[PDB]
């Protein structure tokens, strides 16, 4: 990408990554990290918290607390 | 043709009776062992002293009065006669339990293969 | 003919008790585990034999590796009566069954 | 354990042995290779690729030489024929002299310096050409179909295939590949005219849809591509033992049938009539779709899937709570099971995805139809390689002789020893056009010397030898063309083995 | 292996020439028929062009290779086949020669073809329209005959094959589809054919005097048995268990009674009198007491009947096949204007004769049935083709290769190239166009050179189409002759040998392959 002269060594750490979105800082100087091996997704349960059936909001709201 | 099928529909029939007879023995005598530990509850339940029926003979059964609600038969070995404590027939029985369990199962895929298998035979027989 | 099914008859006999041992033998095993808990607690008799007899525990731990005697000695007696009897009766159904049809 | 010159001349004696009369069979001009059989099938044959599989292979270079033929056969599938011309000639030529002359790689290294010289010339005698027209296009196509010699039904898989072609051009990498061929999906249907026959907007899927699969008609309403992650949990959140039994029944679908429900409520957010249940696709999952009210799909292929994601063009989702029109089915989609002939017919239309329309291939038979499928499976081929070079370079003796003096001039300008292997390539060159003239009927030797002068003052620019007329001619205006590319590619192979071969001195166990 | 280049060709004109000189006369009634015992191990006799071929186990590339070419050919004409195989190797007689002078064999495939055009183009020069007359008719049947056997063989046979094709068009039909029903009869001589405008079925059931003689024949096609069985268990149903055998015994016997009253019913619902004879006919075997039933009651029915009759008695009668009885009336079941069971040897063949439209015209041949009977059941059928061909074009020329000079005449005469490269292949073309009727003339009689320069000339006089006498060996005129040329006929062998020349005579490479 670019041209050719201007491949060069980068000081830090070479990612080919997802880079993230959705109001994401893009630079964020002086952060601690988390590496996950693990992929978050949401672990799928219809009830683990507000168990209560008040509106249709709140049995969604049930299986929101995953 | 419906010859060998006539033969071929008449044998299927008997395995799946032959097999529907010994599951349905599996479960009674599986049942027993939890009888036996159901036996043992109200056993424990009563009390020592308590006056028992117990299987005597053809047509009679002997009372007798009861002592230590702790003791139970285990029969393991052959014939061999084991007596155990209160808490150890039920798990004695639940392996025997467990044990006819399985060869309950046995039965059910033997038993069921002889008949739509059968049911196979029947028809290109009318058909 | 008569001969076929005499010999495969006490086959088919003492291979199923036999088998009836295999469940016992686990209980065998077993036993040797329930009765070796058992101190004297709970009152020991051998089931041996159609008297119920007061016992010790001695009396009760030899009996069972004695009693493993049962699932021993019963299952591989029969290995020979199942041979002894299959091939003699192997043997008798093709010479009966040529004759009567020739 | 065999090596050496012996082999560097058996290499050329496996290799070269091939082409001879392949070469013949090059051009529509073809001598047709009878191969009998052992068991006695008589095979009349100009098309290498037949040749090479049903030929006992002498020579493990033979074996080799099937390899970079089904490299172009897969690479493109157009000019297999040609692969193997110039790698045996390469090495033909020169081999045993500059190994004699003692070096394997003076030629070895004497083989890219010659390949980008034609790449240079290439590009200058390479034309440019209107993608914007399809008939600047067309006419190439149309030459190229003739090169298939079907332009009765195939004229029309000309149009079909570059109207697909221009549609199933796209694709990015970065780099942005011109055209994708694996985005292309053509249909084969008995009933129709090939000339009804046509191309629509994303994966038409006549290939798990040869009946229902789909509804038959679903307008606005989204299929749902499942890369879920949909699988009915036995428990809720965790998997317990499988059901053998009635209790494992009770229990177990408690906990399965709300996960589905979980999952496939998640689904009917999207607004589905359809759903096509690629994984996940199980005894309950399915089952909960007509409960959730929309139709569910079993057990597809994701081959489909994402020619579907490539249809409706979405893209396939994992995600089990989070299921939408973006994540799976994008655009308002069109998903229309049409019986065409009698087989009902899966066309997802309304694509989003760039370009991207796919071909409805319907024959008053299939075979009616095969006659263009094929061709139109070689115009694609053709049209894509005016996409991937859109360059147009005139055919045969033009392309041919025009390299050679450059490669002479070249080897000229070097003076060195890699100018004998040049000095063999220009030449290795020369043979296609003699042997169009081979295959036309005149003396080439004359045409060749012709073609020379051809060169000696055109410099051969649109001017070879044409051998289906057999005489010096004007590509351009003849029209007779081709792309760079296939071109450049075919040849550029041409040149890998013959690099190979030479390379090899070691045959053994 | 491999044979090179002027070797693989010098392979492929060999193999055609052995061949055609078995065809040279193959052809035309000096055409000399040809027997075949190592194409079975059966005794054969067979004279055709490409049915030889097939006839044979033919190891040779070439020849199995024609086979498969001639047949598109001889799946029209069946005449001019056994003419194929000359004009092809010939031609390769002739352009291997100027290979071998030198050339490509490449300009002269190329050079055929403006010949081959000009050919296509004098063909229409040359074909006559003519008309449909039974007599125009005749006398292409009979040259195909003649070809195909003698021409009293020819002359005899020929009258049923011009009679059924004009049935066959007065379904308007313009080829030969039904009518096409051929029988070979039990006899002494196979000088016995009939012309059955309707049908004929080959069996009386078991039964005589059902009335058998039909006057008025409303026909039943009955795929199904008025005989089930006579015994205890059905005609599908069998048993070895004991109680279900005695289930079946009762109803066997009356579920026929069911079928035969039906028609005893039926009888007297198609008739209510005895007098119209009522045929029933049935695919599979029918009771005796069934027939007895139905015989004295006047009823005519047929059992062990063919389906293809019973294709042909559904469409010949307007009949109908069924598989059941019951009552209907007489046109439900279709009607055959004559029906008579005809006994020759022990069968009695019922002829269903003059069916409403009796869109199947039955040909019968009464012989002995020997592969001679079979021998002469080809040329008829061929020359139904051939007529059929007749029927396809009303363009129609002289036949004994009158066409060939005024070919060759005009062809190369002109240059059609006007260059060496396209007349080098015309030359070769439209010579090899002459090979047969010259060697007809020179295989009846009168060399080539003489018939040749004779017809060259009389040609060049007359622009007639004068073509050989094959019993003189001089030409006549063949439209005179009456062995004539459809043009649906003699066009496809400028196809063939053309097409079939272009490949096989570019191959340098050949190898077993696999």
């Known amino acids: ?30 952060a601690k990290i988390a590496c996950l091996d693990f992929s978050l997704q949401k672990t799928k349960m219809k009830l683990g918290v507000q168990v209560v059936i008040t509106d249709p909001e709140k049995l969604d709201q049930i299986r929101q607390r995953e | 043709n419906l010859p060998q099928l006539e033969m071929l529909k008449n044998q299927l029939d008997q395995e799946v009776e032959f097999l529907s007879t010994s599951i349905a023995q599996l479960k009674v005598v599986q049942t027993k062992y939890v009888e036996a530990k159901d036996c043992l509850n109200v056993l424990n339940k009563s009390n020592e002293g308590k006056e028992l029926l117990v299987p005597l003979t053809s047509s009679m059964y002997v009372p007798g009065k009861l002592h230590d609600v702790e003791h139970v038969l285990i029969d393991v070995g052959t014939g061999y006669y084991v007596e155990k404590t209160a808490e150890d027939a039920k798990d004695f029985f639940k392996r025997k339990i467990d044990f006819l369990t399985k060869q309950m199962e046995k039965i059910q895929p033997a038993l069921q293969e002889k008949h739509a298998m059968k049911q196979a035979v029947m028809e290109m027989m009318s058909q | 003919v008569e001969k076929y099914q005499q010999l495969q008859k006490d086959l088919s006999k003492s291979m199923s008790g036999r088998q009836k041992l295999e469940a016992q033998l686990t209980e065998n095993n077993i036993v040797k585990e329930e009765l070796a808990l058992l101190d004297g607690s709970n009152v020991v008799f051998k089931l041996l034999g159609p008297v119920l007899v007061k016992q010790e525990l001695g009396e009760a731990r030899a009996t069972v590796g004695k009693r493993l005697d049962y699932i021993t000695a019963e299952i591989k007696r029969y290995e020979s009566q199942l041979r002894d009897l299959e091939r003699q009766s192997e043997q008798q159904r093709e010479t009966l069954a040529q004759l009567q049809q020739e | 354990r065999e090596s050496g010159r012996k082999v560097q001349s058996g290499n050329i004696n496996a290799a070269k042995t091939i082409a001879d009369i392949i070469r013949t069979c090059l051009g529509p001009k073809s001598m047709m290779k009878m191969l009998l059989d052992p068991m006695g099938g008589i095979v009349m044959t100009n098309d290498g690729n037949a040749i090479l599989r049903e030929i006992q292979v002498q020579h493990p270079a033979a074996k080799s030489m099937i390899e970079i033929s ?172 499988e059901i053998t039994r009635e209790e494992d029944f009770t229990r177990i679908l408690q906990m399965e049938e709300e996960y589905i429900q979980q999952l496939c409520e998640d689904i009917i957010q999207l607004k589905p009539d359809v759903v096509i249940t690629e994984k996940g696709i199980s005894d309950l999952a399915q089952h909960y779709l007509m409960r959730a009210n929309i139709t569910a799909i079993r ?187 296939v071109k450049l590619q075919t040849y550029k192979t041409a040149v890998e083995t013959a690099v190979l071969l030479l390379r090899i001195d070691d045959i053994v166990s | 292996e491999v044979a ?83 004009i092809i190797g010939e031609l390769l007689k002739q352009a291997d020669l100027y290979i071998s002078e030198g050339l490509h064999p490449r300009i002269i495939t190329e050079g055929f073809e403006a010949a081959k055009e000009k050919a296509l183009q004098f063909l229409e020069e040359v074909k006559v329209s003519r008309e449909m007359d039974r007599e125009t008719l005749i006398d292409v049947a009979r040259t195909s005959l003649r070809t195909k056997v003698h021409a009293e063989l020819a002359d005899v046979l020929t009258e049923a094959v011009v009679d059924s094709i004009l049935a066959i068009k007065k379904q308007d039909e313009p080829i030969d589809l039904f009518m096409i029903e051929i029988m070979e009869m039990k006899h002494k001589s196979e000088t016995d054919t009939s012309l059955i405008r309707g049908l004929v079925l080959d069996h009386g059931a078991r039964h005589p005097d059902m009335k058998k003689r039909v006057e008025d024949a409303y026909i039943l096609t009955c795929n199904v048995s008025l005989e089930y069985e006579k015994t205890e268990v059905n005609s599908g149903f069998f048993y070895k268990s004991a109680e279900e055998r005695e289930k079946l015994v009762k109803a066997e016997r009356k579920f026929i009674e069911d079928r035969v009253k039906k028609i005893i019913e039926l009888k007297r619902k198609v008739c209510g009198d005895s007098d119209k004879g009522f045929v029933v006919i049935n695919q599979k075997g029918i009771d005796p007491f069934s027939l007895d039933a139905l015989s004295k009651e006047g009823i005519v029915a047929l059992r062990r009947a063919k389906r293809r009759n019973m294709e042909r008695l559904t469409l010949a009668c307007g009949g109908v096949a069924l598989n059941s009885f019951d009552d209907l009336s007489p046109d439900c079941l279709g009607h055959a204007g004559l029906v008579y069971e005809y006994t020759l040897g022990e069968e009695k063949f019922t002829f269903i004769e003059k069916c409403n439209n009796p869109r199947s015209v039955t040909l019968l041949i009464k012989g002995p049935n020997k592969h001679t009977l079979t021998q002469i059941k080809d040329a008829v059928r061929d020359g139904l083709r051939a007529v059929k061909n007749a029927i396809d074009d009303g363009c129609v020329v002289p036949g004994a290769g009158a066409v060939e000079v005024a070919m060759a005449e005009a062809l190369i005469k002109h240059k059609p190239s006007v260059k060496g490269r396209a007349q080098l292949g015309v030359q070769a073309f439209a010579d090899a166009l002459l090979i047969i009727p010259k060697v007809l003339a020179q295989n009846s009689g009168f060399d080539l050179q003489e018939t040749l320069v004779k017809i060259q000339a009389e040609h060049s006089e007359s622009g007639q189409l004068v073509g050989v006498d094959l019993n003189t060996g001089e030409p006549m005129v063949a439209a005179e002759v009456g062995v004539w040329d459809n043009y649906c006929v003699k066009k496809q062998l400028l196809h063939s040998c053309t097409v079939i020349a272009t490949n096989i005579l570019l191959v340098d490479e050949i190898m077993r392959a696999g």
């Not at chain 4, 590949?177 to 999906?185: F, L, S």
């Not at chain 4, 049409?338 to 409805?360: M, R, S, V």
């Not at chain 4, 070249?410 to 042997?435: C, D, F, H, N």
């Not at chain 5, 027997?35 to 097939?54: Q, R, W």
Request: glycine share 8%; charged share 25%.
């Open chain 1, 1 to 30: 990408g670019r041209s050719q002269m201007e491949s060069m060594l980068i000081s830090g750490y070479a990612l080919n990554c997802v880079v993230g979105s959705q109001g994401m800082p893009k630079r964020i100087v002086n």
């Open chain 4, 70 to 241: 089904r490299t172009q056969d897969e690479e493109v599938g157009d000019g297999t024929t040609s692969v193997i011309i110039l790698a045996g000639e390469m090495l033909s030529v020169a081999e045993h002299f500059l190994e004699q002359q003692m070096h394997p790689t003076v030629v070895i290294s004497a083989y890219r310096k010659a390949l980008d010289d034609m790449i240079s010339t290439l590009k200058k005698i390479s034309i440019p050409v209107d993608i914007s027209d399809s008939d600047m296009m067309l006419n190439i196509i149309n030459s190229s179909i003739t090169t298939k010699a079907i332009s009765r039904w195939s004229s029309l898989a000309c149009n079909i295939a570059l109207d697909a072609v221009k549609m199933v051009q796209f694709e990015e990498n970065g780099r942005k590949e011109i055209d994708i061929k694996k985005y292309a999906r053509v249909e084969k249907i008995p009933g129709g005219i090939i000339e009804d026959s046509c191309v629509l907007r994303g994966v038409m899927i006549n290939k798990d849809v040869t009946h229902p699969r789909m509804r038959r008609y679903i307008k606005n309403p989204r299929i749902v591509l499942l890369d879920s992650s949909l699988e009915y949990k036995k428990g809720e959140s965790q998997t317990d033992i």
């Open chain 4, 299 to 485: 057990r597809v292929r994701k081959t489909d899937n994402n020619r579907i994601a490539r249809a409706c063009g979405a893209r396939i989702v994992s995600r089990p709570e989070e299921l939408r029109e973006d994540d799976v089915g994008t655009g308002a989609g069109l998903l229309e099971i049409k019986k065409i002939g009698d087989e009902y017919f899966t066309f997802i239309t309304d694509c989003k995805d760039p370009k991207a329309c796919t071909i409805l291939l319907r024959g008053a038979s299939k075979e009616i139809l095969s006659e263009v499928e094929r061709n139109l499976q070689d115009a694609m081929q053709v049209c894509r390689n005016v996409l991937l070079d859109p360059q147009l370079v005139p055919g045969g003796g033009a392309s041919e002789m025009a390299v050679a003096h450059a490669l002479t001039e070249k080897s000229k300008a070097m003076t060195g020893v890699e100018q004998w292997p040049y000095r063999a390539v220009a030449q290795a060159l020369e043979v296609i056009p003699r042997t169009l003239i081979q295959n036309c009927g005149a003396s080439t030797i004359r045409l060749l010397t012709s073609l020379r002068a051809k060169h000696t003052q055109e410099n051969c620019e649109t001017w070879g030898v044409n051998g289906e007329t057999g005489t010096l001619v004007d590509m351009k205006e003849l029209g007779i063309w081709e792309p760079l590319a």
């Open chain 5, 4 to 86: 090179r280049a002027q070797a693989a060709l010098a392979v492929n004109i060999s193999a055609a020439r052995g061949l055609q000189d078995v065809l040279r006369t193959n052809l035309g009634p000096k055409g000399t028929m040809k027997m075949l015992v190592s194409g079975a191990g059966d005794i054969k006799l067979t004279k055709d062009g490409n049915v030889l071929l097939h006839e044979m186990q033919i190891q040779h590339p070439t020849a199995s290779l024609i086979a498969k070419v001639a047949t598109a050919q001889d799946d029209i004409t069946g005449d001019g086949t056994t003419s194929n195989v000359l």
